[PDB]
Symmetry: C2
Protein backbone atom coordinates (compact mmCIF):
# COMPACT_ATOMS: atom_id res chain seq x y z
CA UNK A 1 0.00 0.00 0.00
CA UNK A 2 1.79 3.18 1.20
CA UNK A 3 5.09 3.66 3.09
CA UNK A 4 5.01 5.69 6.27
CA UNK A 5 7.60 7.65 8.21
CA UNK A 6 8.57 5.29 11.06
CA UNK A 7 8.03 6.69 14.53
CA UNK A 8 11.22 8.14 15.96
CA UNK A 9 12.56 5.71 18.65
CA UNK A 10 12.97 8.55 21.20
CA UNK A 11 11.82 12.11 21.99
CA UNK A 12 12.93 14.85 19.55
CA UNK A 13 15.36 16.29 22.19
CA UNK A 14 16.60 12.94 23.51
CA UNK A 15 19.87 13.22 21.52
CA UNK A 16 20.96 16.66 22.81
CA UNK A 17 23.73 17.73 23.25
CA UNK A 18 24.95 15.64 20.30
CA UNK A 19 22.09 16.39 17.90
CA UNK A 20 19.76 19.29 18.53
CA UNK A 21 16.00 19.25 18.73
CA UNK A 22 16.04 21.58 15.73
CA UNK A 23 18.14 19.12 13.68
CA UNK A 24 15.74 16.33 14.46
CA UNK A 25 12.82 18.62 13.55
CA UNK A 26 14.31 19.22 10.14
CA UNK A 27 16.17 15.99 9.46
CA UNK A 28 13.42 13.57 10.58
CA UNK A 29 10.36 15.74 10.29
CA UNK A 30 11.11 17.33 6.94
CA UNK A 31 13.89 15.54 5.01
CA UNK A 32 13.01 11.95 5.99
CA UNK A 33 9.28 12.79 5.56
CA UNK A 34 9.95 14.25 2.04
CA UNK A 35 11.67 11.04 0.99
CA UNK A 36 8.65 9.01 2.17
CA UNK A 37 6.20 11.30 0.36
CA UNK A 38 8.26 11.28 -2.85
CA UNK A 39 8.71 7.52 -2.69
CA UNK A 40 4.91 6.98 -2.43
CA UNK A 41 4.25 9.47 -5.26
CA UNK A 42 6.75 7.83 -7.57
CA UNK A 43 5.92 4.18 -6.82
CA UNK A 44 2.20 4.60 -7.17
CA UNK A 45 0.91 2.49 -10.08
CA UNK A 46 4.33 0.93 -10.90
CA UNK A 47 5.53 -2.64 -10.39
CA UNK A 48 7.24 -1.38 -7.18
CA UNK A 49 3.88 -0.49 -5.65
CA UNK A 50 3.41 -3.29 -3.12
CA UNK A 51 7.03 -4.40 -2.89
CA UNK A 52 8.88 -4.35 0.42
CA UNK A 53 11.24 -1.40 0.87
CA UNK A 54 14.42 -3.54 0.77
CA UNK A 55 13.44 -5.04 -2.54
CA UNK A 56 12.72 -1.62 -3.98
CA UNK A 57 16.19 -0.45 -2.80
CA UNK A 58 17.85 -3.48 -4.34
CA UNK A 59 16.06 -3.33 -7.67
CA UNK A 60 15.14 0.28 -8.55
CA UNK A 61 16.86 3.17 -10.24
CA UNK A 62 16.35 6.89 -10.82
CA UNK A 63 14.06 8.81 -8.52
CA UNK A 64 12.44 5.73 -7.03
CA UNK A 65 15.87 4.48 -5.96
CA UNK A 66 16.99 7.77 -4.54
CA UNK A 67 13.88 8.13 -2.41
CA UNK A 68 13.64 4.41 -1.45
CA UNK A 69 17.25 4.11 -0.40
CA UNK A 70 17.07 7.39 1.55
CA UNK A 71 13.92 6.23 3.43
CA UNK A 72 15.74 3.02 4.39
CA UNK A 73 19.05 4.74 5.22
CA UNK A 74 17.37 7.33 7.50
CA UNK A 75 15.32 4.71 9.36
CA UNK A 76 18.51 2.75 9.82
CA UNK A 77 20.34 5.91 11.06
CA UNK A 78 17.70 6.74 13.75
CA UNK A 79 17.99 3.15 15.05
CA UNK A 80 21.80 3.53 15.24
CA UNK A 81 21.37 6.38 17.74
CA UNK A 82 19.99 6.34 21.29
CA UNK A 83 19.90 8.39 24.52
CA UNK A 84 20.43 5.16 26.46
CA UNK A 85 23.60 3.43 27.62
CA UNK A 86 24.64 0.53 25.42
CA UNK A 87 27.66 -1.71 24.78
CA UNK A 88 28.75 -4.07 22.02
CA UNK A 89 27.83 -7.78 22.45
CA UNK A 90 30.74 -10.12 23.16
CA UNK A 91 30.37 -11.49 19.65
CA UNK A 92 30.49 -8.04 17.99
CA UNK A 93 33.39 -7.04 20.20
CA UNK A 94 35.34 -10.16 19.25
CA UNK A 95 34.66 -9.54 15.52
CA UNK A 96 35.78 -5.84 15.77
CA UNK A 97 38.93 -6.86 17.60
CA UNK A 98 39.81 -9.55 15.14
CA UNK A 99 39.12 -7.45 12.03
CA UNK A 100 40.36 -3.99 13.07
CA UNK A 101 42.63 -4.80 16.03
CA UNK A 102 40.41 -3.21 18.69
CA UNK A 103 37.09 -1.48 19.13
CA UNK A 104 38.93 1.88 19.34
CA UNK A 105 40.79 1.14 16.04
CA UNK A 106 37.46 0.49 14.36
CA UNK A 107 36.14 3.82 15.69
CA UNK A 108 39.21 5.57 14.35
CA UNK A 109 38.98 4.02 10.86
CA UNK A 110 35.25 4.59 10.67
CA UNK A 111 35.58 8.20 11.75
CA UNK A 112 38.26 8.78 9.16
CA UNK A 113 36.11 7.20 6.39
CA UNK A 114 33.11 9.32 7.39
CA UNK A 115 35.18 12.56 7.45
CA UNK A 116 36.72 11.82 4.03
CA UNK A 117 33.55 11.05 2.17
CA UNK A 118 33.28 13.80 -0.46
CA UNK A 119 29.92 15.49 -1.07
CA UNK A 120 26.76 13.98 0.34
CA UNK A 121 26.76 10.37 1.53
CA UNK A 122 26.96 7.74 4.24
CA UNK A 123 29.57 5.75 6.23
CA UNK A 124 28.69 2.16 6.95
CA UNK A 125 29.84 -0.80 8.92
CA UNK A 126 28.59 -3.86 7.12
CA UNK A 127 28.77 -7.68 7.37
CA UNK A 128 29.44 -9.38 3.97
CA UNK A 129 28.16 -12.89 3.04
CA UNK A 130 31.24 -14.59 4.43
CA UNK A 131 30.40 -12.85 7.70
CA UNK A 132 33.39 -10.52 7.36
CA UNK A 133 33.25 -6.93 8.64
CA UNK A 134 34.03 -4.02 6.21
CA UNK A 135 33.87 -0.22 6.31
CA UNK A 136 31.92 0.96 3.26
CA UNK A 137 31.16 4.48 2.13
CA UNK A 138 28.33 5.46 -0.20
CA UNK A 139 27.50 8.57 -2.24
CA UNK A 140 24.12 10.28 -2.04
CA UNK A 141 21.39 7.64 -1.56
CA UNK A 142 23.78 4.67 -1.94
CA UNK A 143 22.95 1.73 0.30
CA UNK A 144 24.98 -1.49 0.88
CA UNK A 145 21.94 -3.66 0.33
CA UNK A 146 22.49 -3.12 -3.38
CA UNK A 147 25.88 -4.89 -2.96
CA UNK A 148 24.36 -7.76 -0.97
CA UNK A 149 25.96 -6.49 2.26
CA UNK A 150 24.11 -6.22 5.58
CA UNK A 151 24.30 -2.84 7.27
CA UNK A 152 25.25 -2.74 10.95
CA UNK A 153 25.92 0.95 11.66
CA UNK A 154 25.60 4.12 9.64
CA UNK A 155 26.64 7.75 9.96
CA UNK A 156 24.78 10.23 7.71
CA UNK A 157 27.31 12.74 6.35
CA UNK A 158 24.96 14.79 4.14
CA UNK A 159 25.45 18.35 5.33
CA UNK A 160 21.84 18.58 6.57
CA UNK A 161 22.69 16.00 9.24
CA UNK A 162 25.09 18.34 10.99
CA UNK A 163 24.99 21.85 9.54
CA UNK A 164 22.59 23.41 12.09
CA UNK A 165 24.65 22.13 15.02
CA UNK A 166 28.28 22.07 13.70
CA UNK A 167 28.22 24.14 10.50
CA UNK A 168 31.18 22.90 8.35
CA UNK A 169 32.87 21.02 11.26
CA UNK A 170 31.93 17.53 10.21
CA UNK A 171 34.75 16.05 12.31
CA UNK A 172 33.22 17.42 15.51
CA UNK A 173 29.86 15.90 14.51
CA UNK A 174 31.48 12.46 13.79
CA UNK A 175 33.44 12.58 17.02
CA UNK A 176 30.25 13.42 19.04
CA UNK A 177 28.13 10.76 17.40
CA UNK A 178 30.02 8.01 19.21
CA UNK A 179 28.41 9.20 22.48
CA UNK A 180 24.89 8.24 21.14
CA UNK A 181 25.72 5.17 19.05
CA UNK A 182 23.26 2.44 19.79
CA UNK A 183 25.55 -0.58 20.27
CA UNK A 184 22.58 -2.75 21.12
CA UNK A 185 21.09 -2.21 17.66
CA UNK A 186 24.49 -2.68 15.98
CA UNK A 187 24.94 -5.94 17.90
CA UNK A 188 21.49 -7.19 16.98
CA UNK A 189 22.21 -6.54 13.31
CA UNK A 190 25.59 -8.34 13.61
CA UNK A 191 23.85 -11.47 15.06
CA UNK A 192 23.75 -14.27 12.29
CA UNK B 1 50.75 29.66 -4.25
CA UNK B 2 46.94 29.53 -4.91
CA UNK B 3 45.03 32.23 -2.98
CA UNK B 4 41.40 32.68 -1.96
CA UNK B 5 40.45 35.52 -4.32
CA UNK B 6 38.76 38.63 -2.91
CA UNK B 7 34.92 38.57 -2.79
CA UNK B 8 33.50 41.06 -5.36
CA UNK B 9 31.37 42.81 -2.72
CA UNK B 10 31.07 43.21 1.08
CA UNK B 11 30.22 40.12 3.12
CA UNK B 12 26.75 41.52 3.86
CA UNK B 13 26.04 42.92 0.37
CA UNK B 14 23.86 39.99 -0.71
CA UNK B 15 21.42 40.25 2.23
CA UNK B 16 18.60 39.43 2.32
CA UNK B 17 19.08 36.71 -0.31
CA UNK B 18 22.26 35.30 1.23
CA UNK B 19 23.18 36.19 4.84
CA UNK B 20 26.56 37.51 6.06
CA UNK B 21 26.71 34.31 8.10
CA UNK B 22 26.46 32.21 4.94
CA UNK B 23 29.14 34.26 3.22
CA UNK B 24 31.49 33.83 6.24
CA UNK B 25 31.22 30.02 6.28
CA UNK B 26 30.76 29.48 2.55
CA UNK B 27 33.43 31.84 1.35
CA UNK B 28 35.54 32.20 4.50
CA UNK B 29 35.80 28.51 5.40
CA UNK B 30 34.52 26.18 2.62
CA UNK B 31 36.10 28.12 -0.30
CA UNK B 32 39.29 28.65 1.71
CA UNK B 33 39.54 24.95 2.60
CA UNK B 34 39.48 23.95 -1.04
CA UNK B 35 42.28 26.47 -1.72
CA UNK B 36 44.33 25.22 1.20
CA UNK B 37 43.81 21.54 0.37
CA UNK B 38 44.68 22.07 -3.27
CA UNK B 39 47.96 23.82 -2.41
CA UNK B 40 48.83 20.92 -0.17
CA UNK B 41 47.91 18.32 -2.79
CA UNK B 42 49.58 19.90 -5.83
CA UNK B 43 52.97 20.27 -4.11
CA UNK B 44 55.57 17.90 -5.53
CA UNK B 45 53.26 16.94 -8.41
CA UNK B 46 53.10 17.87 -12.11
CA UNK B 47 50.39 20.39 -11.30
CA UNK B 48 52.83 22.33 -9.05
CA UNK B 49 52.95 25.80 -10.59
CA UNK B 50 50.31 24.96 -13.20
CA UNK B 51 47.23 27.19 -13.62
CA UNK B 52 43.82 26.47 -11.97
CA UNK B 53 41.87 25.84 -15.18
CA UNK B 54 44.62 23.50 -16.53
CA UNK B 55 44.52 21.53 -13.29
CA UNK B 56 40.71 21.16 -13.56
CA UNK B 57 41.00 19.97 -17.14
CA UNK B 58 43.84 17.50 -16.38
CA UNK B 59 43.57 16.14 -12.80
CA UNK B 60 41.64 13.39 -11.08
CA UNK B 61 40.74 12.40 -7.52
CA UNK B 62 41.50 14.74 -4.63
CA UNK B 63 43.34 17.28 -6.79
CA UNK B 64 40.40 17.54 -9.15
CA UNK B 65 37.86 17.84 -6.36
CA UNK B 66 39.70 20.71 -4.66
CA UNK B 67 40.71 22.49 -7.92
CA UNK B 68 37.24 22.24 -9.48
CA UNK B 69 35.62 23.49 -6.24
CA UNK B 70 38.00 26.42 -6.14
CA UNK B 71 37.11 27.29 -9.70
CA UNK B 72 33.37 26.66 -9.20
CA UNK B 73 33.10 28.85 -6.08
CA UNK B 74 35.00 31.82 -7.61
CA UNK B 75 32.69 31.51 -10.63
CA UNK B 76 29.60 31.45 -8.38
CA UNK B 77 30.63 34.59 -6.42
CA UNK B 78 31.02 36.47 -9.74
CA UNK B 79 27.51 35.30 -10.75
CA UNK B 80 25.98 37.22 -7.84
CA UNK B 81 25.78 40.97 -7.21
CA UNK B 82 24.18 43.63 -4.99
CA UNK B 83 23.92 45.88 -8.07
CA UNK B 84 21.32 46.25 -10.79
CA UNK B 85 22.34 44.33 -13.97
CA UNK B 86 20.67 43.04 -17.16
CA UNK B 87 21.38 40.68 -20.00
CA UNK B 88 23.10 41.96 -23.19
CA UNK B 89 20.94 41.81 -26.23
CA UNK B 90 23.06 38.98 -27.76
CA UNK B 91 22.66 36.91 -24.56
CA UNK B 92 18.96 37.69 -24.42
CA UNK B 93 18.60 36.70 -28.09
CA UNK B 94 20.40 33.41 -27.51
CA UNK B 95 18.19 32.73 -24.48
CA UNK B 96 15.01 33.26 -26.46
CA UNK B 97 16.09 31.00 -29.38
CA UNK B 98 17.12 28.16 -27.07
CA UNK B 99 14.58 28.33 -24.24
CA UNK B 100 11.78 30.24 -25.96
CA UNK B 101 11.99 33.16 -23.52
CA UNK B 102 14.04 34.57 -20.69
CA UNK B 103 11.40 33.59 -18.17
CA UNK B 104 11.36 30.03 -19.61
CA UNK B 105 15.08 29.91 -19.15
CA UNK B 106 14.67 30.87 -15.51
CA UNK B 107 11.96 28.26 -14.94
CA UNK B 108 14.03 25.50 -16.57
CA UNK B 109 17.19 26.53 -14.80
CA UNK B 110 15.38 26.61 -11.47
CA UNK B 111 13.86 23.20 -12.11
CA UNK B 112 17.34 21.82 -12.93
CA UNK B 113 18.89 23.37 -9.82
CA UNK B 114 16.12 22.03 -7.58
CA UNK B 115 16.13 18.53 -9.15
CA UNK B 116 19.92 18.02 -8.65
CA UNK B 117 20.19 15.23 -6.19
CA UNK B 118 22.80 15.41 -3.46
CA UNK B 119 25.51 18.05 -3.64
CA UNK B 120 26.29 19.79 -6.89
CA UNK B 121 25.79 22.67 -9.31
CA UNK B 122 23.43 23.90 -12.00
CA UNK B 123 25.05 25.54 -15.04
CA UNK B 124 24.25 27.59 -18.08
CA UNK B 125 27.04 26.89 -20.58
CA UNK B 126 27.91 27.48 -24.21
CA UNK B 127 28.35 24.18 -26.14
CA UNK B 128 30.37 23.35 -29.29
CA UNK B 129 27.45 24.16 -31.68
CA UNK B 130 27.52 27.72 -30.29
CA UNK B 131 24.29 27.12 -28.46
CA UNK B 132 23.14 27.58 -24.90
CA UNK B 133 22.67 24.53 -22.69
CA UNK B 134 21.57 23.81 -19.10
CA UNK B 135 23.70 21.05 -17.47
CA UNK B 136 24.04 20.00 -13.87
CA UNK B 137 27.03 18.54 -12.10
CA UNK B 138 27.55 16.38 -9.07
CA UNK B 139 29.84 17.31 -6.26
CA UNK B 140 32.88 19.00 -7.81
CA UNK B 141 31.94 18.43 -11.43
CA UNK B 142 32.81 21.27 -13.76
CA UNK B 143 31.81 21.93 -17.47
CA UNK B 144 35.44 22.77 -18.26
CA UNK B 145 36.15 19.05 -18.22
CA UNK B 146 33.70 18.70 -21.15
CA UNK B 147 35.24 21.71 -22.84
CA UNK B 148 32.02 23.63 -22.34
CA UNK B 149 31.92 27.31 -21.56
CA UNK B 150 30.31 28.22 -18.22
CA UNK B 151 28.19 31.38 -18.21
CA UNK B 152 26.18 31.09 -14.89
CA UNK B 153 26.11 28.67 -11.92
CA UNK B 154 24.08 28.12 -8.78
CA UNK B 155 25.74 26.15 -5.99
CA UNK B 156 23.16 23.65 -4.61
CA UNK B 157 25.44 21.98 -2.04
CA UNK B 158 23.39 22.24 1.17
CA UNK B 159 26.03 24.52 2.76
CA UNK B 160 25.11 27.18 0.09
CA UNK B 161 21.71 27.76 1.65
CA UNK B 162 21.10 25.66 4.83
CA UNK B 163 21.81 28.53 7.23
CA UNK B 164 19.34 30.86 5.48
CA UNK B 165 16.71 28.44 4.11
CA UNK B 166 17.29 25.03 5.85
CA UNK B 167 15.79 22.35 3.52
CA UNK B 168 13.91 24.91 1.39
CA UNK B 169 16.21 24.75 -1.67
CA UNK B 170 13.42 26.03 -3.94
CA UNK B 171 13.12 29.26 -1.89
CA UNK B 172 16.91 29.70 -2.16
CA UNK B 173 16.89 29.12 -5.92
CA UNK B 174 13.96 31.48 -6.36
CA UNK B 175 15.66 34.14 -4.20
CA UNK B 176 18.91 33.83 -6.17
CA UNK B 177 17.42 35.55 -9.27
CA UNK B 178 17.35 38.76 -7.24
CA UNK B 179 21.11 38.82 -7.15
CA UNK B 180 22.09 37.22 -10.48
CA UNK B 181 24.84 39.27 -12.17
CA UNK B 182 23.64 39.53 -15.72
CA UNK B 183 26.72 41.62 -16.64
CA UNK B 184 29.00 38.75 -15.66
CA UNK B 185 26.87 36.19 -17.50
CA UNK B 186 27.03 38.53 -20.56
CA UNK B 187 30.83 39.05 -20.34
CA UNK B 188 31.45 35.26 -20.08
CA UNK B 189 29.17 34.76 -22.98
CA UNK B 190 30.95 37.23 -25.16
FE1 LIG C 1 20.03 12.73 6.05
FE1 LIG D 1 29.77 25.67 -2.06
Amino acid sequence: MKFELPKLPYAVDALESTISKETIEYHYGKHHQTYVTNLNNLVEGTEHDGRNLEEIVKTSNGGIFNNAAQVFNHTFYWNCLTPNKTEASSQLKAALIETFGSVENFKEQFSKAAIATFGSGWAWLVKNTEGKLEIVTTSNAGCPLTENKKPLLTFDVWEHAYYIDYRNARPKYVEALWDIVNWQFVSEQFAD
